[PDB]
Write a protein that binds this ligand. Structure first.
Ligand code: HEC
Ligand code: HEC
Ligand code: HEC
Ligand code: HEC
Ligand code: HEC
Ligand code: HEC
Ligand code: HEC
Ligand code: HEC
Ligand code: HEC
Ligand code: HEC
Ligand code: HEC
Ligand code: HEC
Ligand code: HEC
Ligand code: HEC
Ligand SMILES: [Ca+2]
Ligand SMILES: [Ca+2]
Lengths: 520, 72, 520, 75
């Protein structure tokens, strides 16, 4: 049984915590619920930590008083098909392998499944750790509660004796690095300096051995990623997001200065040895748009290359942890502003960007976002109970499972079938244009070897490579983004027609150049 | 928002409650969750109640930390 | 009404039958249930048959006393979609036509459906008899009971006046030969010598005119394929299986000498004119693994070519009826040991194997097989009845239809949805790797004409052809095998990554060789 | 066995933290958790049939008891 400690004693040295804890809705929640600090108190001074106290990062630390929210979060949606590769004719990107050739995603890129699995799925995907980590057996793939208790309760490491990234099976890659983990867990929140910069007080950084870092991490999507454990108030903890919104002054809503001011973020910095160490962003309101943007954004979390001179940009560079915080039509400018690209296409040799799940940036400017609707309204709504205390569902899933609460409450003019039909109209149309964009990209890609072999000039090939950058960007945004156009259908339509235009321009350029070589 | 009270001061007069509260699984649950005793503490002695503190009997006093049980 | 005959009179000349019949659970079942032997008894001697008795091979001969088993066998699973071509984007092998080009399966290869249809489906598929046989109309495709009563009650022959294999429609093939029928029916069990070798007493053999043989055959999957009609004990009748297990001493479980000894097979040979003629394999136990391996195996049942010199291997050769009895990683060695391949690829010219439904060989060494689980546990379980006499279901179908009896009885920790999710995790992952294997095989195949036309040497082309053999084997095993990895997920993963590796090696070889030609 | 085992059982969850249901109601609503977990030999219909055999028999004897009470009262 827990025994309370005297918080006044802590507050003597921890004024920032005092100011947060004594004012919010956790004012009565004793420190012992989440910290074991006995030896810390015996050995600390006002500026020196002494013995390090233990801090619980497990989600059970919150489930004791908030069981309903914990249970709704951990539920597994079995209809979210697991380990389903996207580069197949029945999934999101039928021609993904030809289009992404050169990139590590060619090794495996599955559709997302329930949040409980995020850390284990990151560890076991074929592109991440060379196949080093597996579930203990193929049965454990169902065990969401086990994954939440801890990744290492359900996974095995093929070689606990080495810590290098290497292939354990032939068709795997070693794309994982420490930046990835920031969108899977925050177990390392006290062990990682802001942005993953080098820091005397940080055990882990962007340049750490990722296999060693992985072994220290256990829990997915900690409850405190969106809720300050001291004030219980709304926040974000993700460094890259704080950096975009606050350090770079872009605001929570870059396209709306007024909403950015009403629904803003305040950066709070904690020090080690009186030197800035880590930061959080306190939100003005409980704004799930910005909470979910900690992870559902396009980002860099990887090494790459410079557009200017092609030189390598390694994990040690700040750009290896970056939120572009730009919609699809501002993205090229955002990548140029940091002089960065992801990979060279294996067939065309074009410098290309790699896009990843840009739901937040796509949602900006859409009809729903403009009307003040937020992610949680459709994906984690309040529960409706005939007789019960209302709480917010933490299931985070498609509104198809709760259409009454997620759509029909606002759309009184519709039945559930009508609302589903409206969603499917948009997804069907958008998917048709994704498929057509891939057809044209593939047709362009296939002309590159024919053009090289016919003696087409490097000048003409480079012209086609510049077109490839845009054809790729304006297509891949939409296979990366998970709503298949729903979050912003007009923008998806404009972008995908732009992709097709760019590919068609490149096909015409290469076809003509090949024909001229042949005729000469 | 609830503000915690000094339970040790309560216990100077409330030994029976001390022996129950400090040992069980509500040892970290502050009295303010269920009692409003400010004027009581200002006026009581160990032998005179003074102002009668308020005790919450509503089920919401428990539903805050135990929503699943309350809802079922 | 049947009138019994005096079996003692038969036993005077039929000692093997006496020893089987008098001891088993059919000791009280009179011969007249399955034989009309009156004129036989009048004319036979102890060594000469005289008039041939009639033997019933229809399944109704067993349904009279075993209606529950018969009815469960004949049920049609309407959810097993019929006539569904596998070479489509929504089925098992989206790029099958490019990959299999040169082989008769290019003409049609559908997914399997219920066992009642096996003989009719073999007769009507476009690759088998040149389109000679059809259902009487398109309505009859539903009639499982009719097909069981007899193929020729539901089919038509376009030309009863000729018996040659030829095309009746342009896009058909004539791949059928008499060996095929051994996995569709055993109506010919008294008319076919062991292995289909030539024999004075055999009406039919490997070299027979298959159209004439077809017309003599009626019933699918005779009940006596797994149950001796005399002793009622467990057996197999399939010659190729007996040959692998017993003649070649490979055992019922080639990877487990102890299980092979506990769950073994005894070959029993019957003679004609005191010369060996036919054989059965009596099983030590009622082992459905080996019963189902009569048909659900990789096999040769066709002519082919020698790896050594490329010469034709015809139906007259023993190798045209062959069970390899080898898992995917032992298969290349098994084909080399008989010096055999199936076809030359139409585009690459590579000698290639053709793989077919290797469920038995894939199941070996899997977690379930190692724990003593057998096909019937998941595909024909005991019925569960609140109040009833238990019998074994003969429906032979996916466990999805009976998860309580086929999975959940062993997996108490799971709900039906959890068990389905576990299956789908494996099938989704395996299918993703099949699709990726096909992408790389197709990329390699497309380089062959480009390489030939660029003047790439035969030496380099032959190097790529050797790689094609392996890339093909390690992919096709898994489109052929029906569980999409479920029966052995780790082996599927290792094999498919091997396929991709082999194709990638060949792509790099050909791309470099083409580039060098162009540069010269 | 105690009242809670049949009338306020532990909740069964595929993935979740277990708690005790406080919905103190007939086991007919939750037969998996309030009956069949202990009676593996039965389906839900069989367990319901066993309950109804007792209730029907008992109710018939209640009605007969009332018939005889009423006959006495009327005298
Ligand atoms: C002054 C004598 C202190 C008292 C009393 C307590 N703590 Fe402390 N703590 C102190 C220092 C100088 C530091 C280093 C950070 C800083 O502010 O300079 C800390 C650090 C912590 C941490 C962070 C530990 C980590 O892993 O990074 C926690 C969780 C913490 N302290 C908790 C804590 C509690 C709960 C206390 C009362 C029981 C407490 N501290 C007393 C200085 C002092
Ligand atoms: C019991 C000892 C608690 C533990 C452990 C945690 N929380 Fe809590 N929380 C608790 C109470 C009594 C309240 C107030 C309830 C009320 O509505 O009056 C809360 C409140 C929250 C809130 C809402 C805050 C707000 O709206 O301003 C959140 C988001 C919250 N709590 C989250 C939370 C998390 C993430 C925890 C683990 C780190 C956690 N709480 C622990 C009681 C208890
Ligand atoms: C980083 C810590 C994340 C935050 C914050 C949010 N999400 Fe998320 N989400 C994340 C990952 C890594 C995954 C895939 C997990 C896996 O194992 O595959 C997801 C998944 C979703 C899904 C799909 C769920 C399903 O049933 O398939 C949805 C609908 C989703 N995420 C929505 C969402 C919303 C609305 C958020 C703010 C409340 C949110 N997520 C936060 C990573 C992270
Ligand atoms: C936050 C900005 C992220 C970083 C950094 C990484 N990932 Fe991620 N991941 C993120 C979200 C919001 C989702 C769900 C939405 C989606 O489109 O997938 C994911 C999902 C995964 C998955 C499951 C799906 C899949 O691709 O197979 C894996 C295996 C995964 N993520 C791995 C991964 C790796 C290896 C990373 C560093 C290179 C990485 N993620 C970074 C959010 C974020
Ligand atoms: C961001 C992706 C979140 C994570 C991770 C967690 N919660 Fe949450 N929570 C979130 C939102 C958007 C809201 C609603 C805010 C609003 O007012 O609209 C909530 C709410 C809570 C509350 C308040 C009571 C309620 O509304 O249900 C509690 C007590 C709470 N959340 C607890 C909780 C716990 C225990 C978590 C880990 C399992 C958890 N939250 C994660 C957003 C996010
Ligand atoms: C209602 C107006 C929505 C708001 C606001 C947000 N999303 Fe959404 N999302 C919506 C729909 C109708 C769909 C398609 C779901 C389907 O079943 O067809 C989606 C999809 C997602 C997904 C993929 C979910 C899945 O396929 O299982 C994710 C990860 C997702 N959305 C995230 C997300 C975030 C982070 C949002 C705020 C920025 C957001 N959505 C807003 C409906 C709505
Ligand atoms: C949050 C501030 C709480 C309030 C208000 C109430 N309870 Fe509580 N309770 C709380 C915690 C953190 C725990 C321990 C959880 C754990 O298992 O570690 C409890 C425990 C209980 C129990 C279980 C006790 C036991 O098993 O020994 C019961 C029966 C319980 N609580 C009941 C209860 C009632 C009836 C309340 C209103 C008067 C109540 N609790 C308030 C947190 C909080
Ligand atoms: C009635 C006259 C029968 C005909 C015709 C067939 N069988 Fe039979 N069978 C019969 C009886 C009375 C029994 C014994 C039942 C018992 O359990 O005591 C059987 C048994 C079988 C068995 C089980 C054998 C064993 O477990 O050892 C099988 C597999 C069986 N019978 C199969 C079978 C087949 C395939 C038939 C047609 C060729 C057939 N039986 C005919 C009664 C009768
Ligand atoms: C040769 C005589 C066979 C034996 C012995 C077994 N099977 Fe079979 N099976 C066979 C064929 C030719 C077919 C396809 C029939 C058609 O017309 O397409 C099949 C089909 C199956 C299926 C799929 C059924 C469906 O619903 O689609 C299953 C699950 C199956 N077979 C399993 C199986 C098992 C477990 C066996 C041993 C008890 C078994 N079969 C024997 C050929 C033959
Ligand atoms: C036993 C070793 C077999 C021989 C010899 C032949 N077939 Fe077959 N066939 C067999 C099984 C176990 C199945 C079901 C599993 C599957 O993957 O299909 C089949 C199925 C068929 C089908 C239906 C499916 C299809 O391919 O369209 C047909 C039309 C079929 N088989 C025809 C066929 C021909 C023409 C054969 C000789 C060349 C032949 N089969 C041999 C088992 C066996
Ligand atoms: C092999 C592919 C089989 C064919 C063809 C038939 N049956 Fe079968 N039968 C099979 C197995 C694996 C079993 C269970 C053996 C065990 O003990 O586990 C059976 C069982 C029988 C029995 C016994 C009673 C029972 O268990 O139901 C009978 C009477 C029986 N089978 C009859 C039967 C008939 C009439 C068939 C043709 C319609 C038939 N079997 C085909 C395997 C195979
Ligand atoms: C349970 C542990 C199984 C054992 C033992 C065997 N198989 Fe199986 N099989 C299993 C599953 C879960 C699946 C996928 C079914 C689905 O609906 O997803 C299969 C598939 C088959 C098929 C194809 C069935 C179809 O698609 O309709 C066949 C022909 C099949 N399996 C045959 C088979 C044989 C011959 C076995 C013993 C060697 C065997 N299976 C074992 C589960 C299990
Ligand atoms: C399972 C073995 C039981 C135990 C232990 C207890 N009761 Fe029960 N009760 C049980 C059944 C099967 C029924 C009939 C319900 C039906 O739907 O037919 C009951 C009935 C009640 C009722 C009336 C419920 C209603 O009609 O809605 C009450 C008030 C009730 N039981 C209370 C009760 C108490 C207080 C117990 C412990 C002393 C108790 N029951 C034990 C099954 C079981
Ligand atoms: C008696 C009629 C009860 C009333 C009134 C309430 N609860 Fe209860 N509670 C009861 C039992 C029999 C049990 C299980 C004890 C066991 O270990 O078997 C419980 C349990 C709790 C718990 C512990 C966690 C759990 O098992 O769910 C808590 C937190 C709890 N109960 C809270 C609770 C609240 C908030 C109530 C008022 C709405 C409540 N209980 C009423 C019996 C009784
Ligand atoms: Ca990116
Ligand atoms: Ca073969």
């Amino acid at each position: 049984n827990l025994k309370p400690v005297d918080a006044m004693q802590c507050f003597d040295c921890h004024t920032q915590i005092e100011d947060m804890h004594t004012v919010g809705k956790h004012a009565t929640v004793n420190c012992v619920h989440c910290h074991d600090a006995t030896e810390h108190v015996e050995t600390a001074s006002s500026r020196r930590m002494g013995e390090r106290p233990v801090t619980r990062m497990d989600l059970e630390a919150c489930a004791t008083c908030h069981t309903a929210q914990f249970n709704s979060f951990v539920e597994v949606r079995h209809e979210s098909h697991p380990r389903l590769e996207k580069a197949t004719p029945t999934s999101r990107s039928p021609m993904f392998d030809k289009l992404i050739a050169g990139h590590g995603f060619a090794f495996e890129h599955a559709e997302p499944r329930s949040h409980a699995f995020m850390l284990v799925d990151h560890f076991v995907v074929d592109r991440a750790y060379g196949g080093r980590f597996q579930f203990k057996n193929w049965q454990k793939v169902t065990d969401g509660m086990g994954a939440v208790r801890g990744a290492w309760t359900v996974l095995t490491d093929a070689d606990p004796e080495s810590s290098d990234q290497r292939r354990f099976l032939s068709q795997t890659a070693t794309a994982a690095n420490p930046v990835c983990l920031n969108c899977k867990t925050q177990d390392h929140i006290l062990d990682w300096a802001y942005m993953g910069d080098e820091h005397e007080a940080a055990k882990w950084s962007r340049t750490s051995e990722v296999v060693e870092f992985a072994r220290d991490l256990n829990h997915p999507l900690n409850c405190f990623m969106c809720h300050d454990p001291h004030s219980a108030g709304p926040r974000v903890v993700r460094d890259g997001l704080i950096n975009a919104v606050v350090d770079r002054g872009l605001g929570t809503y870059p396209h709306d200065p007024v909403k950015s001011e009403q629904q803003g973020m305040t950066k709070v910095t904690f020090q080690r040895g009186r030197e800035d160490f880590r930061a959080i962003g306190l939100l003005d309101t409980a704004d799930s748009n910005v909470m979910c943007a900690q992870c559902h954004v396009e980002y860099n979390c990887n090494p790459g290359y410079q557009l200017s001179d092609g030189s390598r940009v390694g994990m040690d560079d700040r750009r290896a942890n970056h939120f572009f915080w730009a919609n699809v039509f501002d993205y090229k400018e955002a990548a140029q502003e940091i002089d960065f690209f992801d990979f060279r296409h294996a067939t065309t040799g074009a410098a290309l960007p790699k896009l990843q799940h840009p739901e937040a940036e796509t949602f900006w400017g859409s009809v729903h976002e403009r009307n003040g609707v937020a992610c949680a309204d459709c994906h984690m709504p309040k529960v409706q109970l005939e007789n019960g205390k209302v709480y917010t569902s933490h299931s985070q899933r498609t509104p198809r499972d709760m259409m009454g609460q997620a759509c029909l409450n606002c759309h009184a003019e519709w039945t559930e079938d009508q609302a589903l039909y409206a969603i499917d109209y948009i997804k069907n149309y958008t998917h048709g244009k994704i498929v057509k964009s891939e057809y044209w990209l593939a047709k362009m890609i296939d002309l590159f070897p024919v053009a090289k072999r016919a003696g087409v000039s490097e000048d003409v090939l480079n012209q086609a490579r510049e077109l490839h950058y845009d054809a790729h960007l304006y297509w891949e945004w939409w296979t990366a983004e998970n709503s298949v156009g729903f979050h912003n259908p007009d923008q998806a339509r404009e972008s995908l027609m732009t992709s097709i235009s760019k590919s068609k321009e490149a096909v015409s350029l290469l076809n003509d150049a090949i024909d001229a070589q042949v005729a000469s």
